[PDB]
C-alpha cells in the first residue's frame, strides 16, 4: 500500500509552476550544471532502493 501509487493520468493537466519567476537561473549555469544533473539521474535509483 503506497500513497504515490494512486496518482493518475488526467491530473497532468495544468498544475502550478515549480520554478518561481524571481529566481530564474541564467543560461550560463544551466549549461555548467549538467554534470550533476546527469550524475543525479543515473544513480538516483542505485542509492535509494538498490541498498
Amino acid at each position: 500500500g503506497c500513497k504515490a501509487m494512486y496518482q493518475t493520468t488526467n491530473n497532468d493537466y495544468g498544475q502550478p509552476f515549480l520554478q518561481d519567476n524571481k529566481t530564474v537561473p541564467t543560461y550560463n549555469e544551466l549549461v555548467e550544471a549538467q554534470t550533476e544533473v546527469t550524475r543525479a539521474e543515473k544513480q538516483l535509483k542505485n542509492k535509494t532502493v538498490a541498498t
Binding site: 500500500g1 500513497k3 501509487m5 494512486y6 496518482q7 493518475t8 493520468t9
Partner: protein, 430 residues
C-alpha cells in the same frame, strides 16, 4: 452505478468466490468487519459497484452462495473475511448432488431453485442500473454444473439484455478426479453455449504447471490456485472501478472479442508472475510484460495456443505507461508472427489502459484471447464420453431420474457441431 451481482455455486465455485472477495476487499481497504479503512480517495468513488451500504456504516457484498450440501458453506463462514456475507444470502439443500447432473438439474435442483432465484431477483432490483452477472462454478460436478446451468437459463429469461459472465473450471484428462466427468461436462456445454455471453475456461492442469514451473513453489495448495484465479478475474473488470486512459467495461470486451454469437469461449492469463527469489533480477517494462503475456505456458488452459490461429485477443494494461509504447508492442507482435493470426480480420488485438495497478505491484496485464486452439479441450472430452457412453456405463443413475438417452445423443451432437463449426474458420481464406 452499473453494478454487477456475483453468484457462486458448488464446492469449487464457493472456494473460488471465497478468495475473490478477499482480494477485492483488500484492494478497496475493507476489513473483516466491513468498515472502510483505506488511505486514498479513489477507493471510494466506485465502491458501490461491488458493495452495498448498510445502516451503521458497514459494507456488505452483493454475493449469493448456493449449494446442496452445507459442508462447504459452514467452512467459508467460519474463515477469515467470512463475516462480510449477508446471513440471509446463504441458501442450501440437505441431500447433496453426488456428481449426478440429473439430480442437480431435474429432481433436487428443480425444487430449490425457486428459493435462490428469489434472492437473485431481490438484489437485482436493488441496483440502480444493473450491468450483468458473474458466476464462478465447475463443470465436472453435479451441483456445480447442474444448478449452475439451470440458473443461467432461468436468469436469461427475465434479463435478456444484461450480460452474463461464467468462469468454468472444466476437467482435464491428466488431472483426473471423477469417473463420471465426461457425462455431465458434455451435458453442461450443450446448455451453456445457448445462454451465457462470456465464458472463460480454466484447467487445474494449467494451474498446477504454472505454480510448479513459473512461480516455482515446492508445495502448492488449493489456496494458491484460487489466488491466481482471483487476480485474473479482478483484472477483467478493474477498469470499470478506476479511472484510466481508455475505459472498457465488460460489454465492450464482448463486442470486440465475439465475431459470431456461438464463439464466446475464451482462455485467460495474467502477467507478470515471478518466483520469490528472482524478482530482483527482472525489469518491469512493457516489452517484458508482453513477452510473458504471449507465452504458451502462461495460459490458464491445457490447450496449446500455437496449434491454431488467434481470432481476437484483448489486453488490459494496469498502471502508468506511455500509450505509444503499448500499441507499438501490439503491432510488432502481429507482424512478426503473421502465421498465428487470422488474416481476414485486420488488427485483431484490443488494448485497454487503466491507471491503478494492483496493490504491491508496479505494472500488470490481464490477457483474454479467443483462439481456435480451444477446440482441443472439447475434442478430448468428446473422446472420453463416446468411449464410455457406447457401453452405457454409469448411465442408469442419469436415466433413473426422468432423463433419457435421447438427451445424451443430442448433447454430444451439439458439442460436435460446435467443434466442427469452430474449426472451419481456421481454414477459411480470403
Amino acid at each position: 452505478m452499473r453494478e454487477i451481482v456475483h453468484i457462486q455455486g458448488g464446492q469449487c465455485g464457493n472456494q473460488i468466490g471465497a478468495k475473490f472477495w478477499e482480494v477485492i476487499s483488500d484492494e478497496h481497504g475493507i476489513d473483516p468487519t466491513g468498515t472502510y479503512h483505506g488511505d486514498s480517495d479513489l477507493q471510494l468513488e466506485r465502491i458501490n459497484v461491488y458493495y452495498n451500504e448498510a445502516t451503521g456504516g458497514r459494507y456488505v457484498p452483493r454475493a449469493i452462495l448456493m449449494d446442496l450440501e452445507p459442508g462447504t458453506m459452514d467452512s467459508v463462514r467460519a474463515g477469515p473475511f467470512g463475516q462480510l456475507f449477508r446471513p440471509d444470502n446463504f441458501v442450501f439443500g440437505q441431500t447433496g448432488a453426488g456428481n449426478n447432473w440429473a439430480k442437480g438439474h431435474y429432481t433436487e435442483g428443480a425444487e430449490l431453485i425457486d428459493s435462490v432465484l428469489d434472492v437473485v431477483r431481490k438484489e437485482a432490483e436493488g441496483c440502480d442500473c444493473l450491468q450483468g452477472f458473474q458466476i464462478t462454478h465447475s463443470l465436472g460436478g453435479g451441483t456445480g454444473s447442474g444448478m449452475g446451468t439451470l440458473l443461467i437459463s432461468k436468469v436469461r429469461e427475465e434479463y435478456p439484455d444484461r450480460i452474463m459472465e461464467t468462469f468454468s473450471v472444466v476437467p482435464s484428462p491428466k488431472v483426473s478426479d471423477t469417473v463420471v466427468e465426461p457425462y455431465n461436462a458434455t451435458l453442461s456445454v450443450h446448455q451453456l453455449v445457448e445462454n451465457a455471453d462470456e465464458c472463460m475456461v480454466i484447467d487445474n492442469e494449467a494451474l498446477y504447471d504454472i505454480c510448479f514451473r513459473t512461480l516455482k513453489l515446492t508445495t502448492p495448495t488449493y489456496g494458491d490456485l484460487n489466488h491466481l484465479v482471483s487476480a485474473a478475474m479482478s483484472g477483467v473488470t478493474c477498469c470499470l472501478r478506476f479511472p484510466g486512459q481508455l475505459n472498457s467495461d465488460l460489454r465492450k470486451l464482448a463486442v470486440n472479442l465475439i465475431p459470431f454469437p456461438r464463439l464466446h469461449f475464451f482462455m485467460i492469463g495474467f502477467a507478470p508472475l515471478t518466483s520469490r527469489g528472482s524478482q530482483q533480477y527482472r525489469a518491469l517494462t512493457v516489452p517484458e510484460l508482453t513477452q510473458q503475456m504471449f507465452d504458451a505456458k502462461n495460459m490458464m488452459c491445457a490447450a496449446d495456443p500455437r496449434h491454431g490461429r488467434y481470432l481476437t485477443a484483448s489486453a488490459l494494461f494496469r498502471g502508468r505507461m506511455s500509450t505509444k509504447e503499448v500499441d507499438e508492442q501490439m503491432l510488432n507482435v502481429q507482424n512478426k508472427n503473421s502465421s498465428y493470426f487470422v488474416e481476414w480480420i485486420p488488427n485483431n488485438i484490443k488494448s485497454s489502459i487503466c491507471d491503478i495497478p494492483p496493490k504491491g505491484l508496479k505494472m500488470a496485464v490481464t490477457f483474454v484471447g479467443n483462439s481456435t486452439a480451444i477446440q482441443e479441450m472439447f475434442k478430448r472430452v468428446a473422446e472420453q464420453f463416446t468411449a464410455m457412453f457406447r457401453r452405457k456405463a454409469f448411465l442408469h443413475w442419469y436415466t433413473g431420474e426422468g432423463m433419457d438417452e435421447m438427451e445424451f445423443t443430442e448433447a454430444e451432437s451439439n458439442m460436435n457441431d460446435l467443434v466442427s463449426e469452430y474449426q472451419q474458420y481456421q481454414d477459411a481464406t480470403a
